[PDB]
Design a protein around this ligand. Structure first.
Ligand code: 6OU
Ligand code: 6OU
Ligand code: OLA
Ligand code: PLM
Lengths: 244, 334, 635, 334, 244
């Protein structure tokens, strides 16, 4: 979908200034599960901020599905992200005074849409994720993995195109993380939607198909999987990270 | 329950004491209200509160003791009659759970009884073609083939009779019919029933019945005698089986003795065990080992004792002690 | 979805967590309404003292409104910072910035105005109990009547509406700024800081023990010492929390090896890292607690001070200085069926040299030691002592004077007569008073001389420093009787109020210090409740911050009955340290200057400390009930 | 639930109100305590009492409502966590009774397992005699009596096989084994099984199989074919039965056509019903009417469709519609 | 030590019942290094859960060291499972505010072992796993291959009866995995400690002495090894996996 061309972020508080982003070139296609790995100090959070266009971009040309991110205003940018983009965060952000159905239907209740389509979307999503049986409970009485799965289900209800995602393994153990990654991989194949994980855990990135290693900027040095068995690829990822 | 009562009602005594303290303080801080009268009234009300607490405790801590003695005992009526509304809800919960238990148990038992009835109906539907085969086959001319076929048919019929009596042994008590039984015709019928086995095995029979009449049920006693004779014939080869009945004391005793291989002394106490089979020979593997158990279990309601005396390599003696005539009067009375 | 329903559900959720906030608001409104109703009461003028009576309540009200208005503003900025993960979510969903403000500023006005409206209704029921409490400490037998006094309603409404406007301004400023969209090892510096803090506190404690002992004796040298003590103690207390707890924590940790049980694991992880983060709040709490306890204890001692000192100030039950007035009063007593015992005594005013009898320092001048004004009385007048020639005995106790003016044993006293000097020696110091305070200047004692010596000293009678009346005309009374009518007679004797009575100088002091006790006690109660609520609102965050630790700890076999048993000690250490520091501050403050108001301690101080500890302990007990809920849901 | 709370704790309010009334009445008469300064005390006590009652209502009338919510509908876990000792006792008694119900269910399951074991025991004890009888029968020289004996033996064997398949169809889903099957050897084996009946009734088979391969479960398909052939032979006399297999598009099929009496069109749709019997002929009483039901039910998981074209006086056509090969990939893989 | 008699487990939400344990019976003598492996949707994880006290049982009886665990109340069960049954988890489960000498010594603080013998036991345990040089290094300063040996050392000090390991070598490279397995084997050999391991890695199961192939809640054969080479047993396990 998008293209990265000399992606740079400006700074300059007081006198000291850092060049965190030194030009980024990324080419990805529909129906991919690209992961952007790396090492601490490379501004991965700033990479998300620039990629998501939450912060005002300094330089570089990026075209989200044929539309430049410098070609629209603030309100236009907000409308574009709310109509074309979805988010999943590290710490689940679910209101504790709502239910597992209203939490998922909240983003689609501020769009003036009839009840039948919303009900159909909720049914299909909760059936494909496995939380439909818990359709009217509260987030104060469900386990750790189901809360993250509900947070992921929020971003899949308004038919987006790119699913941005911070580390979805920070506060999860092995079983919950494996189940969530398997569910995300299953959801990727059904409807075309790119997922861009940015994690520092090889286990969570071993379910991907395209890993990028960033030390200070444009580095590439990427693997491509292809026909591996999720184990040799895991060892290759660990080896190529250990070399750096 | 005193500690429990005073730990559940620890929020009302505190309110009473706080009210008393508030009254005393407001009386103290005013010049227009004498303190002594208020002190006296506080004292009197404290004593009356003590008495009231005693009465309310004695009245209130009963139904929960009744339900706690209900939970683990053998009396459903342990729970007392509720009087206050906060007990009727617990009573309704217990009643509903008991009703669900009873309904589920009754439905399950009814379903299993219907299944057993259908199973015995299938047993009858299987046993009928055996009788049809017997009727068709009782026209043979070759002696050896007829003997072999009759032996196999008799074995199958004996197995079916054993299974039917296994089914009916759970309700034999509802099948008991006390009447005097002529031993000689019954023994002759049993001998005629096992003619093919004796013909094939060359087994003879000698009848010496000092006692001719006994008091028992015809069908179950005949089944027991048939089981004993079948076991004696199966465990004996080319030997004479002695059937003797004599009156010892006030009870009639029937003795069945064969000159077969006998029973191992180590296995003598275990012959009446359910499903027991002889481990010495592999020919006894096909034996069900359940006819003796059925006969012994069915003999108890008939007041007939089964005594066994066996010697290894010499023979086995089975004794059936018929009850006294007056011992059935108590059974007839009930 | 149904913004109204969302607001209502959020209001019902808020009412469950912050109930101590609602209680504090209602209590504060009740007290303010009660004081404003009491101030305008026309029956408040029955209290007579140096303080007018209706101008101290006006000061208490203004002092109380600040204590309330700081707590409200600090709580309302602790609260809003826990609603950020919701603000960011609402902004990324699609909502504007002028709709989140209306959502979260209509679920709070309801609570605030409901608490305010309930507080006024419960501030009218207790308006008469405050009157009746006041008219029992400062003895008055007037009548209190229940009424409304509409004048208080306007003041309360205006004050709390202003505070609410301030809260709205602060919330709106927060929302637009922190909005965006974005959802160890010890050093050498810490050791030095901790050592410096402890040393400063100890030096501040040590210096106060001198003050009014021998030194610093100058009407301006004292102020420098006081400023040094206060500054040193405050700075040391502030540095005690930043660095001086980490040092002792490190010692205790690297004094165990590796064997740590559950209690110490839970304990030495909060007060090594989070007590440092709160240094400007705990300091304020401890210093203000110490101030309140010390002031209340001194004001209480001043009662028995009043009784004894007012008995001492006038030796007889009455004091007279005009013969006509005294004779008129005794004639009026004669027909009143009251038999009075009367006895007068002349007094001689002269200066003597007593410089050699002080064992302290020359800096204790209070006048020239060789020209000190003393009083000389005969020996036949005294019915208890019979001294000989060349001997003298002192009189009076004045617990202040002994601590300030140390008196040696027998020395030399030079009689500073016009042309002669007779030396004597000091026999001893007596315990009773014999002459009124007016003749003996401020508190200077009086001497006793022999009849033979008096027979010449009175003949000399140098008229250079003599006062108007060299006599002590003073009328006593009979055995225990009705002194009130006698007081009324005395009051109508002197229309110029130039004479003194025993039971009217023992009432102004009682009234003044009773008013002081009333005001200080109510302000202390309000501050206690405020500090308790503020300290309870931080353990919430400290608890959902330690939730992960409990989760891991429950997969290793530890059960809730052990985690709670370990939390019960962390919640003791988090609540006991400021209390102990405040108690030490109060003890070392009261003891320094208790010999300026009264003559007895260890009686009121213990009771005040126990009451403060009990209420603080209630507010400390109410947090384990929340830690239990947090632990229960972390399986 | 205000009334329940007021009535249940109705004797505690009376004490406080009695104390207030007594204090007011005494202060009325005594000329030493003012009356205008005691209404204040009563007023303060009344507010404290009312607030205490309101705060005590909601902490107590919760568990007895949660029990009613739990009572009948659902959510076995709906009962709240008990706090007071009385709640703890009620909850523990309820939990114990529910555990007893679970134990009773476990005992029922154990009894069912024992009954199934005994049924299988009787099954093998019955299947051995049929093999023994077959071995003995395969020596006869006579023609007509041997034919009659073989007819009866085949009837018994087919009935026992039908009963075995009826018992096994409860767990057939765990016994499925699908592979390529040669139609001709299976049909030959089934015909050889029905040799006696076909010889007695003079019925031959015209085997013309264009399609020689099928994809299904060999055992159950063979059972279905045998049952269909047996029914066609029984319902036909001195007629030829045609068997043809053809490739219909991508699906394999097998046809069995007989020239017998056929089935009445008013009874054709009900032939596959469990226990359905035609009352036109008295000979249909011996027919159990359950082999066709088993055949159709076993054809359901194998994706085999049965279409019937029966005309009275002409014959009946039974067709098995085998599925496509790729339709088994969703069964083998999952 | 372990002995199970026809265990059975049904996982149901009171509306749909699907049994996953169908009469498992196992027999482990004291001091052998066994493993459980096979399939991915089988009940091997639930089998390990039900063998220990982390999960309950529906139908069956299990005996450990003669004592019976099925008929126990939660208090007694928890006390017994604390006093024995060392656990090695998939994830580290390490507290980040303590050292290595305190993480593996905190559980031993409810037995009152004074200080000197406790230090001696810690030295004994740490001299065999090679972590005695890390007594004062926080967990956030050592590599990921040693934060698992720390957990093993924690699980070995109190000398339990049966040690339940649930996929330890799941997130490690080949070198650290081999080193940890060798250390575990040496610990098993020196002091007789039964170890039950669930693994998907044939190399991990190679070091064992017996293997059990749980397939759809059944037995499906059982290897025994014995006096056989490690490599040859590895190809034998590979062939058995190829069959399944
Ligand atoms: C930080 C410190 C917290 C302390 C909080 C205590 C309650 C707040 C208090 C305000 C009044 C405090 C008075 C301190 C002690 C006063 C001692 C005293 O007055 O002695 C005697 C007793 O007088 C009294 O007790 C006055 C009543 C005050 C008692 C404490 C007040 C309780 C306040 C709670 C109830 C008020 C309702 C509003 C607040 C809930 C009076 O002298 P006498 O016995 O008549 O003899 C006369 C001698 N010739
Ligand atoms: C000077 C004299 C002035 C008079 C002072 C009057 C002030 C006292 C008055 C009213 C108290 C208002 C504050 C509490 C009300 C808000 C709490 C509330 O209602 O929440 C309800 C439950 O309340 C609670 O959780 C705790 C109940 C305790 C009652 C409040 C205790 C009063 C304050 C105690 C503090 C003591 C400090 C005293 C220090 C001197 C609803 O919660 P729920 O979980 O939904 O349960 C539903 C039941 N199924
Ligand atoms: C000092 C004068 C007091 C006047 C009367 C007091 C006014 C009402 C005070 C509080 C009533 C009780 C509030 C809390 C009840 C707690 C209920 C509970 O324990 O569950
Ligand atoms: C002089 C009075 C001292 C004691 C005052 C106690 C007042 C009531 C204490 C209990 C209030 C809180 C209890 C419920 C807490 C909860 O449910 O979380």
């Amino acid at each position: 979908i998008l293209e990265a061309n000399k992606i740079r972020k400006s700074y300059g508080n007081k006198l000291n200034k850092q060049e965190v982003l030194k030009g980024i070139d990324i080419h990805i296609e529909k129906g991919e599960f690209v992961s952007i790995m790396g090492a601490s100090g490379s501004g991965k959070t700033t990479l998300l901020n620039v990629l998501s266009s939450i912060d005002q971009v300094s330089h570089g040309t990026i075209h989200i599905n044929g539309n430049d991110m410098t070609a629209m205003k603030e309100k236009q940018l907000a409308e574009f992200r709310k109509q074309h983009l979805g988010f999943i965060f590290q710490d689940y952000n679910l209101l504790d005074t709502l239910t597992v159905k209203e939490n998922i239907l909240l983003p689609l209740s501020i769009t003036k849409l009839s009840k039948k389509e919303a009900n159909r979307k909720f049914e299909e999503v909760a059936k494909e994720l496995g939380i439909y049986e818990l359709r009217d409970k509260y987030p104060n009485e469900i386990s750790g993995g189901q809360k993250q799965r509900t947070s992921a289900g929020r971003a899949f209800i308004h038919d987006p195109s790119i699913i941005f995602a911070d580390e979805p393994t920070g506060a999860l153990d092995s079983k919950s993380a494996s189940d969530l990654l398997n569910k995300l991989s299953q959801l990727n194949q059904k409807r075309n939607a790119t997922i861009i994980m940015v994690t520092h855990d090889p286990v969570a990135a071993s379910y991907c198909g395209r890993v990028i290693f960033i030390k200070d900027g444009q580095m590439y040095t990427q693997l491509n999987k292809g026909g591996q068995d999720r184990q040799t690829f895991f060892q290759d990822i660990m080896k190529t990270q250990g070399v750096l | 329950m005193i500690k429990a009562f005073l730990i559940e009602r620890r929020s009302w005594i505190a309110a009473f004491l706080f009210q008393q303290a508030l009254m005393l303080f407001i009386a103290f801080v005013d010049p227009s209200i004498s303190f002594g009268n208020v002190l006296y009234m506080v004292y009197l009300c404290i004593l009356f509160f003590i008495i009231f607490l005693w009465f309310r405790y004695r009245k209130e801590t009963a139904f929960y003791k009744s339900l706690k003695t209900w939970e683990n005992n053998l009396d459903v009526t342990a729970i007392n009659e509720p009087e206050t509304p906060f007990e009727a809800m617990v009573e309704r919960s217990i009643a509903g759970q008991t009703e669900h238990l009873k309904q589920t148990a009754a439905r399950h038992r009814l379903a299993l009884e219907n299944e057993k009835d259908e199973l015995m109906a299938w047993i009858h539907e299987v046993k009928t073609p055996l009788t049809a085969m017997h009727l068709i086959i009782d026209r043979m001319e070759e002696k050896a083939l007829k003997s072999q076929l009759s032996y196999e048919w008799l074995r199958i019929h004996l197995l079916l009779d054993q299974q039917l009596h296994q089914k009916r042994i759970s309700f034999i008590e509802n099948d008991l019919s006390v009447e005097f039984i002529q031993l000689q015709p019954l023994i002759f019928k049993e001998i005629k029933d096992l003619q093919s086995w004796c013909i094939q095995k060359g087994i003879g029979f000698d009848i010496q019945l000092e006692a001719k009449e006994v008091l028992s049920d015809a069908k179950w006693l005949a089944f027991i005698i048939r089981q004993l004779l079948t076991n004696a014939v199966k465990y004996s080869e080319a030997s004479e089986i002695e059937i003797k009945s004599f009156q010892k004391g006030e009870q009639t005793q029937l003795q069945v003795k064969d000159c077969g291989r006998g029973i191992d002394p180590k296995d003598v106490p275990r012959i009446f065990d359910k499903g027991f089979t002889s481990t010495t020979d592999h020919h006894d593997q096909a034996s069900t080992g359940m006819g003796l158990y059925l006969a012994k279990k069915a003999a108890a309601p008939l007041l007939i004792h089964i005594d066994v005396e066996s010697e290894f390599g010499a023979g086995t003696v089975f004794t059936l002690t018929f009850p006294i005539r007056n011992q059935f009067e108590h059974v007839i009375s009930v | 979805m149904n913004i109204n329903q969302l607001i209502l559900r959020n209001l019902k959720k808020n009412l469950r967590n912050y109930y101590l906030y609602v209680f504090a608001l209602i209590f504060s409104v009740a007290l303010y309404f009660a004081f404003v109703t009491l101030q305008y009461d026309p029956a408040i003028n029955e209290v007579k003292a140096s303080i007018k009576g209706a101008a101290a309540i006006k000061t208490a009200s203004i002092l109380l409104v600040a204590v309330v208005a700081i707590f409200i503003l600090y709580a309302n900025t602790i609260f809003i910072k826990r609603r950020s993960k919701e603000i960011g979510l609402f902004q990324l969903i699609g909502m504007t910035k002028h709709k989140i403000f209306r959502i979260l500023s209509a679920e709070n006005v309801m609570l605030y105005f409901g608490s305010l409206a309930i507080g006024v209704a419960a501030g009218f029921s207790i308006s008469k109990l405050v009157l009746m409490i006041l008219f029992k400490i400062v003895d008055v037998k007037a009548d209190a009547k229940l009424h409304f006094s509409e004048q208080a309603l306007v003041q309360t409404v205006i004050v709390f509406c202003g505070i609410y406007l301030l809260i709205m301004i602060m919330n709106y400023t927060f929302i637009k700024k922190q909005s965006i969209l974005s959802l160890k090892k010890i050093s050498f510096f810490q050791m030095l800081i901790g050592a410096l803090g402890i040393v400063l506190i100890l030096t501040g404690y040590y210096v106060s023990s001198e003050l009014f002992g021998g030194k610093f004796k100058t009407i301006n040298e004292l102020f420098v010492a006081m400023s040094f003590i206060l500054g040193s103690v405050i700075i040391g207390t502030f540095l005690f929390y930043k660095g001086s707890v980490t040092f002792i924590s490190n010692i205790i940790r690297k004094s165990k090896g590796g064997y740590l049980n559950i209690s110490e694991v839970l304990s030495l992880s909060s007060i090594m890292f989070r007590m440092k983060s709160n240094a400007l709040l705990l300091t304020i709490i401890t210093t203000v607690s110490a101030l309140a306890i010390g002031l209340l204890s001194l004001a209480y001692i001043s009662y028995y001070s009043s009784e004894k000192t007012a008995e001492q100030n006038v030796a007889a039950d009455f004091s007279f200085m005009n013969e006509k007035d005294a004779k008129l009063f005794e004639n009026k007593l004669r027909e009143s069926n009251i038999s009075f015992v009367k006895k007068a005594t002349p007094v001689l005013q002269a200066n003597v040299d007593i410089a050699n009898i002080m064992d302290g320092t020359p800096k204790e001048m209070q006048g020239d030691p060789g020209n000190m004004q003393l009083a000389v009385v005969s020996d036949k007048d005294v019915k208890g002592v019979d001294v000989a020639a060349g001997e003298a005995v002192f009189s009076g106790y004045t617990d202040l004077l002994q601590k300030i003016m140390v008196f040696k044993d027998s020395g030399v006293i030079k009689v500073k007569s016009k042309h002669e000097t007779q030396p004597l020696k000091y026999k001893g110091l007596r315990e009773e008073f014999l002459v009124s305070y007016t003749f003996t200047s401020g508190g200077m004692p009086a001497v006793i001389v022999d009849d033979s010596l008096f027979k010449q000293l009175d003949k000399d009678k140098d008229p250079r420093i003599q006062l108007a009346q060299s006599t002590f005309i003073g009328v006593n009374v009979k055995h225990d009787d009705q002194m009130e009518k006698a007081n009324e007679l005395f009051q109508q004797v002197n229309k110029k109020n130039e004479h003194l009575s025993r039971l009217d100088t023992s009432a102004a002091q009682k009234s003044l210090f009773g008013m002081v006790m009333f005001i200080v006690g109510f302000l202390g109660l309000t501050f206690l409740i405020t500090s308790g609520c503020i300290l309870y609102f931080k353990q919430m965050g400290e608890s959902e911050d330690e939730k992960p630790s409990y989760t891991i700890l429950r997969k290793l076999g530890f059960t809730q009955g052990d985690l709670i048993k370990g939390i019960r000690i962390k919640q003791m250490y988090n609540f006991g340290i400021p209390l102990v520091v405040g108690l030490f501050h109060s003890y070392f403050a009261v003891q320094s200057g208790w010999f300026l108001f009264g003559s007895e301690v260890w009686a009121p101080m213990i009771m005040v400390m126990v009451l403060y500890t009990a209420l603080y302990s209630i507010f400390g007990f109410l947090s384990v009930l929340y830690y239990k809920k947090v632990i229960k849901s972390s399986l």
